[PDB]
Design an enzyme around this catalytic site. Structure first.
Site, mmCIF file in Angstrom:
data_model
loop_
_atom_site.group_PDB
_atom_site.id
_atom_site.type_symbol
_atom_site.label_atom_id
_atom_site.label_comp_id
_atom_site.label_asym_id
_atom_site.label_seq_id
_atom_site.Cartn_x
_atom_site.Cartn_y
_atom_site.Cartn_z
ATOM 1 N N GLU A 262 87.157 58.812 37.520
ATOM 2 C CA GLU A 262 86.211 59.906 37.640
ATOM 3 C C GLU A 262 86.496 60.684 38.918
ATOM 4 O O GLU A 262 86.916 60.102 39.922
ATOM 5 C CB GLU A 262 84.760 59.404 37.634
ATOM 6 C CG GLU A 262 84.379 58.465 38.767
ATOM 7 C CD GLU A 262 83.949 59.208 40.009
ATOM 8 O OE1 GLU A 262 83.591 60.395 39.879
ATOM 9 O OE2 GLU A 262 83.960 58.609 41.103
ATOM 10 N N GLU B 95 102.854 34.962 56.622
ATOM 11 C CA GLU B 95 102.591 33.925 57.614
ATOM 12 C C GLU B 95 101.235 33.272 57.390
ATOM 13 O O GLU B 95 101.114 32.044 57.472
ATOM 14 C CB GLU B 95 102.683 34.516 59.020
ATOM 15 C CG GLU B 95 102.153 33.626 60.133
ATOM 16 C CD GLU B 95 102.983 32.387 60.364
ATOM 17 O OE1 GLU B 95 104.191 32.409 60.056
ATOM 18 O OE2 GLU B 95 102.423 31.388 60.860
HETATM 19 N N1 LIG Z 1 81.725 47.817 49.477
HETATM 20 C C1 LIG Z 1 81.186 48.777 48.730
HETATM 21 N N2 LIG Z 1 80.695 48.481 47.477
HETATM 22 C C2 LIG Z 1 80.146 49.454 46.716
HETATM 23 C C3 LIG Z 1 80.074 50.756 47.185
HETATM 24 N N3 LIG Z 1 79.488 51.511 46.233
HETATM 25 C C4 LIG Z 1 79.190 50.720 45.181
HETATM 26 N N4 LIG Z 1 79.595 49.445 45.462
HETATM 27 C C5 LIG Z 1 79.450 48.275 44.581
HETATM 28 O O1 LIG Z 1 80.648 48.079 43.857
HETATM 29 C C6 LIG Z 1 80.386 47.875 42.485
HETATM 30 C C7 LIG Z 1 81.442 48.596 41.664
HETATM 31 O O2 LIG Z 1 80.929 49.851 41.281
HETATM 32 P P1 LIG Z 1 81.688 51.200 41.706
HETATM 33 O O3 LIG Z 1 81.760 51.315 43.207
HETATM 34 O O4 LIG Z 1 80.990 52.389 41.093
HETATM 35 O O5 LIG Z 1 83.148 51.040 41.054
HETATM 36 P P2 LIG Z 1 83.316 51.310 39.483
HETATM 37 O O6 LIG Z 1 82.042 50.981 38.747
HETATM 38 O O7 LIG Z 1 84.489 50.522 38.957
HETATM 39 O O8 LIG Z 1 83.610 52.881 39.357
HETATM 40 P P3 LIG Z 1 83.295 53.602 37.958
HETATM 41 O O9 LIG Z 1 83.660 52.677 36.823
HETATM 42 O O10 LIG Z 1 84.074 54.889 37.855
HETATM 43 O O11 LIG Z 1 81.817 53.900 37.912
HETATM 44 C C8 LIG Z 1 79.005 48.442 42.217
HETATM 45 O O12 LIG Z 1 78.276 47.590 41.367
HETATM 46 C C9 LIG Z 1 78.341 48.521 43.574
HETATM 47 O O13 LIG Z 1 77.354 47.524 43.691
HETATM 48 C C10 LIG Z 1 80.567 51.061 48.443
HETATM 49 O O14 LIG Z 1 80.506 52.213 48.867
HETATM 50 N N5 LIG Z 1 81.122 50.066 49.213
HETATM 51 MG MG LIG Z 2 82.613 55.166 39.651
#
Ligand SMILES: Nc1nc2c(ncn2[C@@H]2O[C@H](COP(=O)(O)OP(=O)(O)OP(=O)(O)O)[C@@H](O)[C@H]2O)c(=O)[nH]1
Ligand SMILES: [Mg+2]
Ligand SMILES: Nc1nc2c(ncn2[C@@H]2O[C@H](COP(=O)(O)OP(=O)(O)OP(=O)(O)O)[C@@H](O)[C@H]2O)c(=O)[nH]1
Ligand SMILES: Nc1nc2c(ncn2[C@@H]2O[C@H](COP(=O)(O)OP(=O)(O)O)[C@@H](O)[C@H]2O)c(=O)[nH]1
Ligand SMILES: [Mg+2]
Ligand SMILES: [Mg+2]
Lengths: 439, 168, 429, 51, 122, 431
Positions: F63, F246
């Site tokens: 996206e 390492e």
């Molecule tokens: N460390 C970190 N984790 C996040 C962040 N934003 C969301 N997450 C967590 O990571 C998980 C993965 O969701 P996304 O960050 O949207 O990644 P994704 O769902 O694979 O992306 P899309 O499929 O395109 O929506 C979510 O359930 C959030 O709880 C962030 O900014 N930093």
């Molecule tokens: Mg996303």
């Protein structure tokens, strides 16, 4: 010395020649009026421009070109535009009535009344050159005058000038997108002439240039202007070896034998990089290895002919700028290590390299960005059988039940000429397949 | 090969030859590269080669060494070159009288570094009662000993005025 | 004792230009032609490579050959280009195009006549020449095709002069020519029966020396050619300068060519150190000898310890001692007796010259007739056969006048040479 | 109606670079008059100096 | 501080690194404040020279010149803070009273030789 | 030399990479333009001929919102217009979409750009993949890209920083499905996998750093600080240097055991930093306390199989050894019987840096904790329960079924995940 005559046939040839000659004038510092700028009017001049422009006692250079088209519109556009002073009223030979995408009409009926004048102009240009390397013919086999009149002109040149080198930088019909509907007929009929009466043929289809412009030069709406600018850059990159001093200069016959393994096998795939806008050029590490890899990438070439689906026969690289011979050697070594692209077994070395000290120049008001170094690659490979298969499957599917054949037979062309051309193209597929087959 | 360059007519005068070579040389001022050809034919006399000679000393009426060759610039070659050389290396003359001989090196050092002039030539002249009027020098220098510096810089006349205002 | 030189092709012309400016520097000759050397020893034998005009200034005794005029223009435009005689620039109009056929049969024949005329007049000018040098690359068209024709015609005209052929035989991984094995195979057979001694050079080995022996990041052809220039200047220095034990080309040939076909040598030059390692290493014969036989210091990319030295020659330059110039070579013989051939005792010819190269307190030039050089011939022959099975890149030669039978004879001669090397490498007493 | 068609314009001009407003003045590089790329390394010292 | 760097280097090569005290002597003989012309003259009789651009920059950053400020910048700016406090400690030991006067007897008493590597070599 | 190629997948991966790169730019003194107003940046940035540098990272998401936010934000100058790939429609928390239907039309060009970066690299140490398995694209493409990288580069080093779903807090209802599906890829085709759950770092920021309203910006900033702490040993000189292989050879005892806990200390605020006297023993104890741990995995609930401590700053081997002995003496944590030493330490002289917009107070001394522990079985015993309690009667399954994935893949992934703990407690059982 080392002169080369540029013969432009058809609308596509005329426009690509316009771009090529604009770019040549820009490289050699020639104003559109045809003369050197007044501020730098040094009395004595070098021999660099001699290869493309004929010198006059008045001090005004004249391009070694022959524009030729049955249709008067494009040639009148040249004669009216900004290069009217540069271009001779002769060597810009014009017809009166068009070929109209008809190979038969352009080769058998309307071509005979202008081929004689075209050869008169060729002789007039050739007698001026004392070290003529050869002829570079720019045309598109898709159209009528490009296919028919071009075929007749190449035949006459072959029968008159003997073994002079000939390079047809021609624009074949692109696989999926096409402009003309009898374009497969014109291509399959002109492949016979480009096979026997042309010494080297270079594919310059349009959609690959479009994709390159869209993905690398970042132009959402590219045009024939941009396509011809890229083609002219490629022509200049290939011909600059004899124009400018370089570490390893090459002439026409230097790469002719190194790129043509067999008389029937001379169609060669073209590719050029780095082709990048100023907005992006300095973001990547524009090194010799990087540009060589980008050229070898299927998305970095000028043709829609995947090499990974085929097998390379012989590669020729034309490096320009601050290129170093062992930087070229390192690029060649990493290409040997790379396994995605594979060469044929009987050709171990398979590489030619020519280093020149002249980096490419960008046209004023253009969209490409000048770069420290560039490279143009021309390669004979077995993958051209696939584009030949596309075009000949097109031709058979069109020719199954006599489509558009009445137009051709009404212009003094026998019906069996189509069958002969089809058999010739089938043999041109078969010999590529046989030579690509393992030993 | 398209790079901006300074074109000058030059002479070499090879030993034994009865006539000067009558060359032209282009110096690409953005780099240290020089190239040379001869006026009659036009063959490349010298390739594009880098030299250690500073660009400030490639002015008209100056001689330099190119690979053991004494090459002397006679005149410019193009009007673009004349314009850019007039803009960059403008020539001027400064004459220092006999009362400043103990500070001769002092004044020369200020010419070279304080005033940013580059000394194309430095000489001494014994003024004559006829040469004074022939060359329009101040009358106070008649029958004396002076030092004359041909020096080039940008705004050479104004820099010389500043020098003569700052010194005696 | 006069040596007249010839340069063929772009590679040969550039190497000859580098060598000529190096030897002019050694003899104290400016591009003007006037001698300004600080020692009379330069004038004492300046004649070997230089012939003076009516003005008292010298010009090289050199003949330049190429179908193309571009490299001629570049050579003449070089810093020492004007030193050459204008009539010695023999050039054609249409290039060879990396075609041994074009350079040897049709385009070379129409110009070898003029080249022979100028060579004849240059040879007759001197009292009695010791012989001919050629500088060329066997991979190119005009350097090789015309080079071998020059070799044949000069051998026919002057049977008893010494013929040195500095041939730059190129390597595939540094290669830049598709018809390279064709050209090399067509040139090697001519060189075998037509050259008194062949002087093998590989661009890969030159690059290796420039990379790790000299630790230079990107030295171009202008620096690659300087090494072979030093090689020539040190291999001929015995004639031009005195020494405790002087030699000549005939001495090197008689001490390094046990059999008529065994006259191919690989090159190495000592000393070769970086700018940062100049003050780290002591300059002495002990340090020279260790790098004389080292692979990375040898400038022909054929691995030395996969073969047995039939013969070798060490041309030392600089005031030194006759003990350590031969006792240490005996030490090399003893501690590398496996690498040296058995039936020939003391494979080392040793020669001493009192004048070292300018800027070096001491130097040595190593010339070795090792059998390990059969690797290059064998692999280039493999490439030749690989392309020759399918008749690839052959219509050019056939249309230019070559014959399949002549190609097969060239292959057979190459196989005979490589077998000649192999059967001395492997056999025992 | 065709007279009213005058005010209608073209949605996308042809041959337009998709510029995203780089800060060339701060970058210190003029995109038109700068030869983008890598100046090839200059090996400090030469074979002549080494000898 | 291009003019400071230029003057410091220029003095270093022209007079030697060990005798940069000449610029201090000249600027002390200069009055405080000093006019720009006499500053140029006295500073430059020891054959240290500045370009017109560097001189204009100096005048703009500093007709009168704050000679004391120029001395302070010359002795202060070209030192990293390590050297800054090292030289401050050395000067404080040499002149415990902060009177701005160093005598030969006190400097000889406070100057060490025996630990010098070369005199260790003997 | 010592190049390390960064890849970021999904919303979480792109945010973590943004924080990481805004940290690395200041660590190297590189402005957002790309140039500084010592080849230390060679690991992360590629220097250009214009005097500026380009990071060695590929941003990727199906996206476009995050990637155009990057393309419009402050680091337009820094980031290459390519290696910043955008998709056309996201997986939308669908591993099936992100792995089979809509990820296969972008994985090819993703690998093309990755191999371009690899060719630019000369001494590439390895890949660092930042993602979250709980998402759709971060799971699907996190599988596709990683398996293609494995088959192209063989056994090249790969470190996957994965934001695993937290035991209590989850922002998606199909998050357990995605996690169980993607653990197969993160196991077979990832050399080291690093736990980066959310709520643990949330509690760490709430307690130690004392912010009433922290956010994703803060959590990714702390994650990036941990990343830089781990990777600084190959970037600056130190008394004890540790490379990727390492510490891989020290933290991977068995091929199936490569999931690693992390923590960092001191995580202190500006007000509390000045007063506290931070010593090596104090920071090591604060690390080994579960409070300073940034993953919801209690050290007391398991046995530490291996310890590795990135000490940064003026830390010294004497104090390191004293802290080591103190950790051995006190019984708060216990080690595995067959691992007597169980410790590795890498000392680096470069103190950690703090970036604008953050909350961490810079500390002259700090230490990061990378650990292999048998307690990692508990997070997976939470995830498998979480997944089974929804998969018991076939919920949220039609979305995956209609996107070209067989229904048996769920069972295969569940069996593999069960094998994870059947190996964890197996290797944790005393001899
Ligand atoms: N460390 C970190 N984790 C996040 C962040 N934003 C969301 N997450 C967590 O990571 C998980 C993965 O969701 P996304 O960050 O949207 O990644 P994704 O769902 O694979 O992306 P899309 O499929 O395109 O929506 C979510 O359930 C959030 O709880 C962030 O900014 N930093
Ligand atoms: Mg996303
Ligand atoms: N690269 C390039 N291709 C072109 C250009 N113009 C046309 N073409 C393509 O080339 C094919 C041949 O068209 P023409 O060059 O006009 O040949 P033609 O139709 O015989 O010309 P006329 O008979 O005089 O109208 C067309 O189908 C186009 O797709 C051009 O300017 N540049
Ligand atoms: N050492 C050296 N080798 C060169 C030079 N120029 C070309 N070569 C080598 O010569 C080969 C090509 O030979 P070429 O000059 O084309 O021969 P020609 O066609 O007969 O003139 C290449 O593989 C290069 O490696 C040079 O200046 N120095
Ligand atoms: Mg038309
Ligand atoms: Mg004798």
């Amino acid at each position: 010395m080392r002169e080369a005559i540029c013969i432009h046939i058809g609308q596509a040839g005329c426009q690509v020649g316009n771009a090529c000659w604009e770019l040549f004038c820009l490289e050699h510092g020639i104003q559109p009026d045809g003369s050197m700028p007044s501020d730098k009017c040094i009395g004595v001049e070098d021999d660099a421009f001699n290869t493309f422009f004929s010198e006059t006692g008045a001090g005004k250079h004249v391009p070694r070109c022959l524009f030729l088209d049955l249709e008067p519109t494009v040639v009148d556009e040249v004669r009216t535009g900004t290069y009217r002073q540069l271009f001779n009223p002769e060597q810009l030979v014009s017809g009166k009535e068009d070929a109209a995408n008809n190979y038969a009409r352009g080769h058998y009926t309307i071509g005979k009344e202008i081929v004689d004048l075209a050869l008169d102009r060729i002789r007039k240009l050739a007698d001026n050159c004392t070290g003529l390397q050869g002829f570079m013919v720019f045309h598109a086999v898709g159209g009528g005058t490009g296919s028919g009149l071009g075929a007749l002109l190449l035949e006459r040149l072959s029968v008159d000038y003997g073994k002079k080198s000939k390079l047809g930088y021609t624009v074949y019909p692109s696989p999926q997108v096409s402009t003309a509907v009898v374009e497969p007929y014109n291509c399959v009929l002109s492949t016979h002439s480009l096979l026997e009466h042309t010494d080297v043929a270079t594919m310059l289809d349009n959609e690959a240039i479009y994709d390159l412009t869209r993905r690398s030069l970042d132009i959402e709406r590219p045009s024939y202007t941009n396509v011809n600018r890229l083609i002219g850059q490629v022509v200049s990159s290939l011909t600059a070896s004899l124009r400018f001093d370089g570490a390893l200069n090459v002439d026409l016959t230097e790469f002719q034998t190194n790129l043509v393994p067999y008389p029937r096998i001379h169609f060669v795939l073209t590719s050029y990089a780095p082709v990048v806008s100023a907005e992006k050029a300095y973001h990547e590490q524009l090194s010799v290895a990087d540009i060589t890899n980008s050229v070898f990438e299927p998305a970095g070439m000028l043709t829609k002919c995947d090499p990974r689906h085929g097998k390379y026969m012989s590669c020729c690289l034309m490096y320009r700028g601050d290129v170093v011979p062992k930087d070229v050697n390192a690029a060649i070594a990493t290409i040997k290590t790379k396994r995605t692209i594979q060469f044929v077994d009987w050709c171990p070395t398979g590489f030619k390299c020519g280093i020149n000290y002249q980096p490419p120049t960008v046209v004023p008001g253009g969209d490409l960005a000048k770069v420290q170094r560039a490279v143009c690659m021309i390669a004979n490979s077995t993958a051209i059988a696939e584009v030949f298969a596309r075009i000949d499957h097109k031709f058979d599917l069109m020719y199954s039940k006599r489509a558009f054949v009445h137009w051709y037979v009404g212009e003094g062309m026998e019906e069996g000429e189509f069958s002969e051309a089809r058999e010739d193209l089938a043999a041109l597929e078969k010999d590529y397949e046989e030579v690509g087959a393992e030993s | 090969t398209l790079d901006s360059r300074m074109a000058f007519h030059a002479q070499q005068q090879d030993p034994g030859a009865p006539q000067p070579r009558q060359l032209i040389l282009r110096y690409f001022y953005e780099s240290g590269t020089v190239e040379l050809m001869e006026v009659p034919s036009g063959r490349l006399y010298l390739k594009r080669t880098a030299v250690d000679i500073p660009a400030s000393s490639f002015t008209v009426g100056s001689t330099v060494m190119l690979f053991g060759k004494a090459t002397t610039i006679t005149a410019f070659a193009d009007e673009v070159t004349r314009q850019l050389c007039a803009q960059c290396s403008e020539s001027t003359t400064v004459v220092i009288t006999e009362e400043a001989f103990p500070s001769l090196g002092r004044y020369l050092a200020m010419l070279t570094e304080e005033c940013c002039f580059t000394i194309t030539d430095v000489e001494m002249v014994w003024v004559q009662r006829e040469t004074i009027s022939s060359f329009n020098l101040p009358e106070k220098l008649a029958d004396t000993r002076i030092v004359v510096v041909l020096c080039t810089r940008k705004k050479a006349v104004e820099k010389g005025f500043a020098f003569v205002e700052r010194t005696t | 004792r006069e040596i007249v030189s010839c340069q063929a092709g772009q590679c040969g012309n550039q190497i000859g230009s580098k060598f000529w400016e190096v030897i002019s520097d050694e003899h104290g000759v400016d591009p003007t032609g006037t001698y300004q050397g600080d020692s009379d020893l330069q004038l004492e034998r300046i004649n070997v490579y230089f012939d003076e005009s009516s003005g008292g200034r010298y010009v090289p005794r050199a003949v330049l050959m190429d179908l193309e005029p571009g490299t001629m223009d570049s050579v003449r435009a070089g810093p020492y280009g004007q030193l050459f005689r204008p009539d010695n620039f023999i050039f054609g109009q249409s290039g060879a195009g990396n075609n041994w056929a074009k350079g040897h049969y049709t385009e070379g024949a129409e110009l070898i006549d003029s080249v022979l005329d100028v060579c004849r007049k240059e040879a007759e000018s001197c009292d009695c020449l010791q012989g001919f040098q050629l500088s060329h690359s066997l991979g190119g068209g005009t350097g090789s095709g015309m080079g071998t024709l020059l070799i044949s015609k000069l051998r026919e005209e002057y049977p008893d002069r010494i013929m040195m052929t500095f041939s730059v035989i190129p390597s595939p991984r540094v290669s830049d020519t598709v018809v390279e094995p064709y050209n090399t195979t067509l040139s090697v057979h001519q060189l075998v029966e037509n050259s008194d001694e062949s002087m093998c050079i590989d661009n890969e080995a030159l690059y290796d020396i420039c990379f790790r022996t000299l630790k230079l990041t990107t030295p171009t052809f202008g620096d690659l050619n300087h090494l072979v220039a030093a090689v020539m200047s040190g291999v001929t220095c015995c004639l031009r300068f005195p020494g405790q034990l002087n030699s000549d080309l005939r001495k090197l040939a008689v001490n390094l060519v046990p059999f008529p076909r065994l006259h191919f040598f690989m090159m190495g030059f000592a000393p070769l150190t970086s700018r940062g390692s100049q003050q780290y290493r002591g300059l002495s014969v002990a340090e020279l000898t260790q790098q004389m036989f080292d692979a990375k210091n040898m400038m022909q990319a054929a691995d030395p310890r996969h073969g047995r030295y039939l013969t070798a020659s060490a041309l030392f330059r600089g005031r030194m001692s006759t003990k350590e110039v031969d006792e240490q070579m005996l030490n090399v013989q003893n501690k590398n007796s496996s690498y040296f051939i058995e039936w020939i005792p003391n494979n080392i010819k040793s020669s001493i010259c009192d004048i070292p190269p300018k800027g070096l307190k001491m130097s040595v030039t190593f010339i070795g007739n090792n059998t390990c050089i059969q690797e290059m011939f064998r692999r280039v022959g493999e490439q030749f056969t690989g392309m020759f099975r399918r008749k690839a890149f052959l219509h050019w030669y056939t249309g230019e006048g070559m014959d399949e039978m002549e190609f097969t004879e060239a292959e057979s001669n190459m196989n005979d040479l490589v077998s000649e090397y192999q059967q001395y490498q492997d056999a025992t007493v | 109606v065709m007279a009213g068609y005058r005010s209608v314009d073209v949605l996308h001009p042809v041959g337009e670079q998709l510029t995203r407003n780089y800060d060339w003045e701060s970058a210190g590089i003029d995109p038109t008059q700068y030869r983008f790329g890598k100046r090839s390394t200059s090996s400090d010292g030469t074979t002549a100096t080494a000898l | 501080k291009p003019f400071l760097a230029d003057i410091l280097n220029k003095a270093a090569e022209r007079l030697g690194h060990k005798q940069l005290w000449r610029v201090a002597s000249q600027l002390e003989r200069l009055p405080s404040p000093a006019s720009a012309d006499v500053a140029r003259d006295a500073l430059r009789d020891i054959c240290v020279f500045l370009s017109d651009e560097d001189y204009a920059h100096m005048c703009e950053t500093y007709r009168m010149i704050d000679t004391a400020a120029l001395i302070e910048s010359l002795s202060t700016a070209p030192l990293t803070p390590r050297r800054r406090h090292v030289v401050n400690l050395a000067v404080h030991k040499l002149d415990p009273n902060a009177t701005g006067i160093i005598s030969y007897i006190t400097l000889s008493d406070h100057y060490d030789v025996l630990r010098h590597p070369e005199v260790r070599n003997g």
